[PDB]
Design a protein around this motif. Structure first.
Motif, short mmCIF file in Angstrom:
data_model
loop_
_atom_site.label_atom_id
_atom_site.label_comp_id
_atom_site.label_asym_id
_atom_site.label_seq_id
_atom_site.Cartn_x
_atom_site.Cartn_y
_atom_site.Cartn_z
N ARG C 66 -53.88 1.36 -21.17
CA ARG C 66 -54.27 1.33 -22.57
C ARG C 66 -54.39 -0.13 -23.00
N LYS C 69 -53.21 -5.24 -27.60
CA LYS C 69 -53.39 -6.10 -28.76
C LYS C 69 -54.68 -6.88 -28.62
N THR C 71 -57.09 -9.93 -30.50
CA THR C 71 -57.18 -10.97 -31.52
C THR C 71 -58.63 -11.39 -31.62
N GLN C 83 -64.05 -10.72 -42.16
CA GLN C 83 -63.69 -10.69 -40.74
C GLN C 83 -63.33 -9.30 -40.23
N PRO C 84 -62.63 -8.43 -40.98
CA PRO C 84 -62.35 -7.10 -40.43
C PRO C 84 -63.62 -6.34 -40.09
N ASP C 88 -64.17 -5.14 -36.34
CA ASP C 88 -64.26 -3.69 -36.19
C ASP C 88 -65.29 -3.30 -35.14
N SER C 91 -63.53 -3.50 -31.90
CA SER C 91 -62.59 -2.39 -31.80
C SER C 91 -63.30 -1.08 -31.49
N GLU C 92 -64.42 -0.84 -32.17
CA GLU C 92 -65.20 0.38 -31.96
C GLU C 92 -65.84 0.41 -30.58
N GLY C 103 -57.18 2.29 -28.13
CA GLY C 103 -56.45 1.91 -29.33
C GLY C 103 -55.60 0.67 -29.12
N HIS C 104 -55.44 -0.11 -30.18
CA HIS C 104 -54.78 -1.40 -30.07
C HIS C 104 -54.29 -1.84 -31.44
N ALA C 105 -53.26 -2.68 -31.42
CA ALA C 105 -52.90 -3.53 -32.54
C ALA C 105 -53.90 -4.68 -32.64
N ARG C 106 -53.94 -5.36 -33.79
CA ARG C 106 -55.02 -6.32 -33.95
C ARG C 106 -54.65 -7.44 -34.92
N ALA C 108 -57.13 -10.52 -37.02
CA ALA C 108 -58.48 -11.01 -37.27
C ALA C 108 -58.43 -12.18 -38.23
#
Lengths: 130, 139, 130
Positions: C66, C69, C71, C83-84, C88, C91-92, C103-106, C108
Motif C-alpha cells: 500500500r 504518505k 508529499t 494546491q489541493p 488531488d 492522488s487520483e 490510499g495515503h496520507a498527504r 501539499a
C-alpha cells in the motif's frame, strides 16, 4: 523544544540542519540573487556535515549507521532559480565522502520561499541504524 | 458541512502501518473552520502565527486520537514537519513551529519529543498560515 | 542519489518531476503560466513517474502492499492557494492504478521554485512485500 535526532525501531530521524560551521550561521540569503550556485553548494555541504555530526553524536559513532534512507533538501530560492538539484548534490556527495556505499539515499530537493534565520539551505534526513 | 471536511481531499487524515502513524498535513482549524490565514510577516504577526501552529498541532493529535481510538496507543512522536506561509524576509519559522512543539509537549509529556523541520513556503492550501504534518510510533 | 531505496518493508521514492518517458513536460508557475487543468496534468505525470520508479525497483507493482504518505510541492504564483486541487490529480492517479492500495496520507504545499522550473514535484513513501 525539539530534539536533533530521534532513534526508534532501527530508524534515525534527523532534524533539519542549517549551514553552520563552529556554531555560526555561515550562509544566509536567497540562492539565485544573493548567493550563486557555488556558495549555495558550500551551504549544503555544511548542512550535510551538521546532519552527520548530529547522527554520530546520537549514536556514539557512525559505525552504527546501516545506511542512509532519505534526504530532503530545502533551498531558499530567488525568482527564477531552478538548480536546486545541483545545490543538494553537494550534500549527497558529502554523504558519499563520509559513508561510502552506506551513504546512498532517495532524495527530494525543492525551492522554498524562506528559511530559519535567513539560511540559504536546510537539510533533513532519515537513516537506518544497527 | 464544509466540503473540505464532509468528504475531504483525496487522502486519509492518518495511515497506520507496521507500528507507525503517518499524519497528513493539518491546517489551523477550529471546529472545522479555517481560523488562521495569510502569510506570516505580512498578514499575520508572530503571536498569531504561533496560535495557528498550536491549532495545527491540536488537529494533528485529534486526527491521531480518532484513528487510534485514544492517545494511549501513541508510543512516542517521531518527526514533525512544519510549513509556514512566509512573507518576503520573514525568517522566524522556528518560533512559529515552537508553538506546535510546545503543544505536543503539554499534551504528551515525554512521549511528545520529536525531531523537526521548519520551512518557509510561498503558499499553503486555502491561504492557511501554517501546515503541520507528523510521524508517530504507535502500539 | 537513488530513485528508490527499499528498507525494512518501506520504499522511499525520490521526488519526481512531470516527465513523459523521461522528458520534462510541464514547467512554469501555477496561477500564472499554467492553469489548474494543466497543473493537474503535471501532477498526474509526477505520480506516474513515482509508480514507474517503484515498479523498476520492485520488479513489478504486485509487491506494493500500500502507499503510505505522499508529499506534493506546487510551484505557485502569488496568491495561488489551490494546491489541493493540483495534488488531488496525483492522488487520483494512484487510486486509478492501485485501487484501495493507493490510499495515503498527504501533505501539499506551495513552493517558490522547483528543479528545472517544473510545475509540480511529488515524493512518496510506500509499504512493500509480496
Amino acid at each position: 523544544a525539539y530534539q536533533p535526532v530521534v532513534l526508534h525501531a532501527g530508524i534515525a530521524y534527523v532534524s533539519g540542519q542549517l549551514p553552520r560551521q563552529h556554531g555560526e550561521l555561515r550562509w544566509t540569503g536567497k540562492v539565485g540573487s544573493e548567493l550563486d550556485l557555488e556558495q549555495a553548494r558550500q551551504a549544503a555541504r555544511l548542512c550535510a556535515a551538521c546532519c552527520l555530526l548530529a547522527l554520530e553524536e546520537a549514536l556514539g559513532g557512525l559505525q552504527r549507521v546501516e545506511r542512509l534512507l532519505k534526504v530532503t533538501g530545502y533551498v531558499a530560492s530567488a525568482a527564477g532559480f531552478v538548480q536546486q538539484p545541483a545545490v543538494i548534490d553537494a550534500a549527497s556527495e558529502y554523504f558519499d565522502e563520509v559513508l561510502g556505499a552506506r551513504g546512498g539515499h532517495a532524495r527530494a530537493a525543492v525551492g522554498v520561499a524562506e528559511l530559519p534565520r535567513g539560511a540559504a539551505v536546510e537539510v533533513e534526513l532519515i537513516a537506518a541504524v544497527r
